[PDB]
Design a protein around this ligand. Structure first.
Ligand code: GNP
Ligand code: CA
Ligand code: CA
Ligand code: MG
Ligand code: MG
Length: 166
């Protein structure tokens, strides 16, 4: 079957794992569980076609930047996650976007910019700000809550469609 190599990137704690676990295991559990590097392979049907989502869930820890080159090198499309209550994580996702472009020698990489934790009240990143960044990349912006599942399928399946339409 068609395989889609999806990589979930972003600063520590923005909800990269929570998003992936909601998609694959249909649940949210509030818990502290930092990622080193985890792989989820799930066969899905998207728009009538069977495909294998090969999802790499990465670490937000700054001490892993050398290891980021490797999975950016081999990754097909990227969920670029920040949290809407964490302005620093929004600044950081600019750096991820630039690194993806440098490692892959391309500004045509399928990506979706994801503003996660949209269930939370203390918003500090406005949607228009994130939309401006996504426009500069030519990519969609989608808000998500791993907690409520709002936008989760939207974000992952839109990334698949962005790859498929590449
Ligand atoms: N309210 C709310 N909390 C969330 C959401 N997504 C994740 N969290 C919470 O935020 C924390 C970090 O989530 P996690 O998925 O582990 O983040 P991560 O980006 O994978 N971290 P790491 O880079 O260390 O692997 C956890 O307490 C988790 O329960 C969300 O959409 N809403
Ligand atoms: Ca181009
Ligand atoms: Ca597009
Ligand atoms: Mg994680
Ligand atoms: Mg280069």
């Amino acid at each position: 079957m068609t395989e889609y190599k999806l990589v979930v990137v972003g600063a520590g704690g923005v909800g990269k794992s929570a998003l992936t676990i909601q998609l694959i295991q249909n649940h949210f559990v509030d818990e502290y569980d930092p990622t080193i590097e985890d792989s989820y392979r799930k066969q899905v049907v998207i728009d009538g076609e069977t495909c294998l989502l090969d999802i790499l869930d990465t670490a937000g820890q700054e001490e892993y930047s050398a290891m980021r080159d490797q999975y950016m090198r081999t990754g097909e499309g990227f969920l670029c996650v920040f949290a809407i209550n964490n302005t620093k994580s929004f600044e950081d996702i600019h750096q991820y976007g630039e690194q993806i472009k440098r490692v892959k020698d391309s500004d045509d990489v399928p990506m979706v910019l994801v503003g996660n934790k949209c269930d939370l009240a203390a918003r500090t990143v406005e949607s228009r700000q994130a939309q401006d960044l996504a426009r500069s990349y030519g990519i969609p912006y989608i808000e998500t809550s791993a907690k409520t599942r709002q936008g989760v399928e939207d974000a992952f399946y839109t990334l698949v469609r962005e790859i498929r339409q590449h």
